[PDB]
Structure 1
Amino acid sequence: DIQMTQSPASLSASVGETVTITCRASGNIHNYLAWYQQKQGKSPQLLVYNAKTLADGVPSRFSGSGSGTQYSLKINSLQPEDFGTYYCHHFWSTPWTFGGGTKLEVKRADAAPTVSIFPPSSEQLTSGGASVVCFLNNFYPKDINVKWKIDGSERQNGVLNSWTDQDSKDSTYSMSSTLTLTKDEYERHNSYTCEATHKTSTSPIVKSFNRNE
């Protein structure tokens, strides 16, 4: 069993720059290495095979090198369609293992999230439920933390978060935070606040509402 150690796991670059992705084999694989590219969960596209040979139709800014147990894929003058995840896959001896993968993301200017908080809808409250939703849209970089407050007190249980991938049009990231409650728990309080902490501010980026208003 020859394993592949791929690094880095994450990489940020901008259109025009050059990045290098490396894979190391736990044993000699004699150039039996294949580099793949995968975008939005779609099917992988072979980029390079046998370590240094470009697949059919692959742009020349792609190039692989290496031998023995050390290989790397170099991408120069990055084009916007070059961003996605990459994987190395050897096929010297069974099992043909894949590298852990490398997510190559677009680097752009910092952008604070645009926060929106939405009270439970009429329809839902009628059914006995009360989900309070908060949107932290179009920010960059992706690191972000959300904190809920009910009547000035932090709330942690009942919260579920989801994160979009880097948008293909503006290179930003978005997040969704949802505080679920029962009609009764929700009606016992007046103020609801959604607070985001992002590197674009040393203060919380907040938005809130009050039932009694």
Structure 2
Amino acid sequence: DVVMTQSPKTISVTIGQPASISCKSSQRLLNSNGKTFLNWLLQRPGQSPKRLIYLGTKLDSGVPDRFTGSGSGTDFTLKISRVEAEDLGVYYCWQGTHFPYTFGGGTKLEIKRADAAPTVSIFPPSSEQLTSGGASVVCFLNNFYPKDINVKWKIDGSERQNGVLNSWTDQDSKDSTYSMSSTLTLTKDEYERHNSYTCEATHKTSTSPIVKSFNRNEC
């Protein structure tokens, strides 16, 4: 099967700057009638892949003319003349000249922006959940940049590492930031035994962590 190799794996680009990414195929993609079945696609966060370029060099239907495909034979390039935040996502190449048809592994376009500290919010277990046996404490770390961040949980000032589950959003095209949710799950009985709960976020916008806490049984 034809191997489609994309590089780089990821690219970070400031809004208004160009981008270029490469797709190299293990066999030539020209066919016996002069057509090159090479497409580029973009998959935006939470969407299906969508058309961009086809026939190697042709803009597909309705696609912004900021996208240009070039190349022939085995070596293809996608250029964006000036990046917009909504261009972020994973760009794929695809070949339809040689059965079975194959896709590249994807190049992720990230938008570079100014640093932003997270907004940190902590939430106690709901009364409804406490009637059930379990107790989840949730911390949101929202709208930060760059994407690396660390969260630490404390119960009555002591670090708790077990029972924590984290989840991360993809980059937002509206403000080019990232967000994270961390949930600490305990039994209802262990939660009701302790008093203070703390979420600490460490990020490069500040030298000391951002700390949000509550006491159980206080509003």
Q: Same fold (TM over 0.5)?
A: yes
1:134 aligns with 2:139: yes
1:195 maps to a residue whose letter is E
Partner of 1:180: 185
Question: Where does structure 2 lack aligned partners over 5 or more consecutive residues?
Answer: 31-35
The Cα of 1:212 is off from its aligned counterpart by 6.1
Amino acid in structure 2 at the alignment position of 1:9 = K
Give the Cα separation in 1 of the matches to 2:153 and 2:163.
Answer: 10
Are positions 1:64 and 2:69 aligned together? yes
Deviates more, 1:178-187 or 1:48-57: 48-57
Once the two structures are TM-superposed, the CA of residue 184 in structure 1 deviates from its matched residue by: 1.2
SS at match of 1:104: strand
Q: Secondary structure at the match of 1:184?
A: helix
Deviation at 1:28, TM superposition (A): 2.7
Question: How has the CA–CA distance of structure 1 residues 122 and 56 changed in structure 2, closer, same or farther, with 3 Å as cutoff?
Answer: closer
Match of 2:95 among 83, 90, 99: 90
**1:101 correspondence with 2:92:** no
Q: Does residue 1:167 correspond to 2:166, yes or no? A: no
Deviations 1:87-129 (A, max 9, x none): 1001121221111112223222100101111111222212222
Residue type at the aligned position of 2:53: V
Q: Distance in 1 between matches of 2:76 and 2:173?
A: 29
Per the TM alignment, residue 144 of structure 1 is displaced from its structure 2 partner at its CA by 1.4
Runs of 4+ in structure 1 over 6 Å off = none
Identity of aligned residues (%): 74
Provide the C-alpha distance between the structure 2 equivalents of 1:140 and 1:72, rounded to a whole number of angstroms: 29
Q: Tell me if the contact between 2:88 and 2:173 (Cα under 8 Å) persists in the aligned partners.
A: no
Q: SS of 1:196's equivalent?
A: strand
- What do residues 135-181 of structure 1 show as CA deviations (whole Å, max 9, x unaligned)? 11111112112121222322222111121222232222111111111
The two structures have a TM-score, normalised by structure 1, of 0.90
Report the secondary structure of 1:47's partner residue: strand
Shift of 1:80: 4.0
RMSD: 1.9
1:13 equivalent to 2:18? Answer no
Secondary structure class of the residue paired with 2:51: strand
In the alignment of these two chains, the number of paired residues is 213
| TM-score normalised by the chain length of structure 2 | 0.88
Indicate how the Cα distance of structure 1 residues 129 and 94 shifts in structure 2: closer, same or farther if over 3 A, else same: same
Name stretches of at least 5 consecutive residues in structure 1 with no aligned partner.
Answer: none
Partners of 1:40 and 1:88 lie apart in 2 by 17
For 2:125, the aligned partner's letter is: P
